[PDB]
Design a protein around this nucleic acid. Structure first.
Lengths: 83, 97, 54, 77, 78
DNA sequence: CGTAAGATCACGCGCGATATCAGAATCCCGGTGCCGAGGCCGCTCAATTGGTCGTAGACAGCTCTAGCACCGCTTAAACGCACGTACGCGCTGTCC
DNA sequence: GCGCGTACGTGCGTTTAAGCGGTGCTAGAGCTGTCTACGACCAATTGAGCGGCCTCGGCACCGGGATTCTGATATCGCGCGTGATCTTACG
């Protein structure tokens, strides 16, 4: 099944909560689309690295260690999923 | 006559951005490096190439920091960089806490 | 790109400023050398709009 | 500490994203979970820097130019 | 010593950085920031030189120090 | 005839753009020297091949477990409108 | 600091697809047995990059001449304000 416009699956209340955890009190209107774009770029890069790692692995499934490796590459090391 | 304030500053901006030579006179910087190093280990000797590399890195870092500071000041509708600008830029960079 | 820049600056021998211009002007090379400072490289000419005279 | 982004829309978004790099790709649920954790930590940090920018503008409401400034200063593109 | 980084030298550096107008407290703040940066880089360089059992801090020690700090420099035998 | 209100022309005053002088910037060119670049010769020191061994990797076959899909159920989550109120934007005074 | 326009919060109403469970099918990952290609090393061979030493020049520097660019001022133009002349209305 084709996938389309899933970036709007990131609803306004989700981004609002996320900013709340970031200490933001008042949020402007057009912010939400820009957070969608920024999340889009970040996901693009991280999943690019993970997909390349899977491709070398000759596997048809992305594994958690692939994500952890990609995050370590981006200077964004993550604990709690191995590695 | 008199040049209106702010014009000669733009002229220097044009002048220095077209050139690459170091903007800190060597000997005071060398003495500062020697003083700083002395606190870590005594009777130390420095290669001139090492000192030059230190100056290049420091000046480039300062220029980048000033660029970020100017951007931050402009974001505040301002034209003059002020210490809060450097502090905010360093904070967002993550070097200052 | 460095030889191109040197031709633009009308020079026969490539000097580091040519290298800095070539790397920073090119978006992809600039991204590759994102954490590299080139000695005697200088900076690109860039003045913010609001700083310009009216 | 519980996640703020809802799990299923995020999973659909990630599946679309990966499909555009390469088709016929499957995911371990743990891999999707790690992706979501990384994304949430990143954007919470980004919102913190944005709020710092907005206060610097003598403002209280974060505005898109604030995130642009923060990402420029971060060195992101 | 630290004051040897003259106010006008800081103005020249800012001018190369594109700054038009500069505050008075700026200069002292920049002196502090430069002090911190030099402290860190020279600390790493000394650590390296000590590990080299040499009384001369060399250029490669400096290059390795900036490489650690994610501030890689070119033109000194990288 | 005589006075009062209105339209138009002439004259005077005020704000903005664009002709000129003038000192500081910038570019170009005649003519010289140089320290760095370039090439040739020697010399070590580096690359390559005859030929061997274990080593890692490739391949094939048996096992199966989480990965994927749908259906039903339940409901927390998402979207539109009244409004008014603090926030955003714009003008202005002061003096650092 | 003052003044005015307004974006969106809370609340309410309404609607819906996201999680739990329940079932069902299953893809390629993971774990044994076969089979084979190759790189380190040793001898021996051969040859190329580095350094020393020559030779040469693109550009800095000096000095001079020529072309450009803000700061100041003044005229042209347009817009607003005032008096004179012609017009209309009232007495």
């Amino acid at each position: 099944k084709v996938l389309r416009d899933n970036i709007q699956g990131i609803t306004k209340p989700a981004i609002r909560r996320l900013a709340r955890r970031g200490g933001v009190k008042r949020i402007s209107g057009l912010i939400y689309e820009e957070t969608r774009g920024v999340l889009k770029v970040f996901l693009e890069n991280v999943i690019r690295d993970a997909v390349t790692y899977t491709e070398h692995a000759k596997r048809k499934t992305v594994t958690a260690m692939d994500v952890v490796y990609a995050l370590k590459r981006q200077g964004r090391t993550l604990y709690g999923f191995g590695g | 006559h008199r040049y209106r304030p702010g014009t000669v500053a733009l002229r220097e901006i044009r002048r220095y951005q077209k050139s690459t030579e170091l903007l800190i006179r060597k000997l005071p910087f060398q003495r500062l490096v020697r003083e700083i190093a002395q606190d870590f280990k005594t009777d130390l000797r420095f290669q001139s190439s090492a000192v030059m590399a230190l100056q290049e890195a420091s000046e480039a870092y300062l220029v980048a920091l000033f660029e970020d500071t100017n951007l931050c000041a402009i974001h505040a509708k301002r034209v003059t960089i002020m210490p809060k600008d450097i502090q905010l830029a360093r904070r967002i960079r993550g070097e200052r806490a | 790109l460095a030889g191109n820049a040197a031709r633009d600056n009308k020079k026969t021998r490539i000097i580091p400023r040519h290298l800095q211009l070539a790397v920073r002007n090119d978006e992809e090379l600039n991204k590759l050398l994102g954490r590299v400072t080139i000695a005697q490289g200088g900076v690109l000419p860039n003045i913010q709009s609001v700083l310009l005279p009216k």
